[PDB]
Amino acid sequence: VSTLIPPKVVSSKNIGSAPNAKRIANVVHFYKSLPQGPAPAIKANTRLARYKAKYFDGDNASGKPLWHFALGIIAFGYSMEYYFH
Amino acid sequence: QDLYLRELKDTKLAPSTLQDAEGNVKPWNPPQKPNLPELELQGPEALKAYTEQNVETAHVAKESEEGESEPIEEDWLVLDDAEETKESH
Incomplete structure (x- = not known):
């Protein structure tokens, strides 16, 4: 006989x-x-981390690190070719 | 005049032995002396309800009931129905 009780249930x-x-x-x-x-x-x-916090940072990450890496690669390759060719 | 005594004795003799004094009936054959207080005693009784309304029967009706001391069973039944009604809200 009790009424329903929404806020009580x-x-x-x-x-x-x-x-x-x-x-x-x-x-x-x-x-x-x-x-x-x-x-x-x-x-x-940590060399790799030095690159991470120096040039490889995501704030800019432009082509400048890529150009520097290419310059280093060609600098090493010049000596390698002098040794070989 | 003659009527001044004749009609007064007319209305003081027959009505005397017709009612009020309640004895005998001289003017007409049917008597109302035992008709109005005895036969007509049940007149309104026949017209009205007899043994029910004239006697005012002391009908002791059953007292108002309740949930018959219903335990917590009805409480959780109410809980269940309220819950299933409020689930679809």
């Missing part, structure tokens, strides 16, 4: 179907993350 009722499914996905995606640009890790110098 919300323990099992969630927000539709998709919103409750994505609530767990969105609650923790924003929890454990850097606030703003933390840990840049820019500093690196």
Whole structure:
């Protein structure tokens, strides 16, 4: 004889179907993350890492590193050809 | 005049032994002395409801009932129906 109780029965009722499914996905995606640009890790110098933080950086990454690599390759090849040819 | 005594004795003799005093009937054969208080005693009784409304039967109707001390069973039934109604909201 008791009336229905919508706001009293919300323990099992969630927000539709998709919103409750994505609530767990969105609650923790924003929890454990850097606030703003933390840990840049820019500093690196290990020849390969020296190239990474010197010319191979993605801020520009223009053809200048490629031209420098080609210049070094042809400089080595000149001596190689002198040895061979 | 003559009528001044004749009609007064007319309306004081026959009505005297017709009603009020309630004894005998001289002017006409049918008597209303045992007709109006005895035969007509059930007159309105016949016209109205007898043994039901004239006696005002003390009909003791059944007292208002309730959920008959229903346990938590109806509580969780209400929970279930509310949940299935609110699931599609």
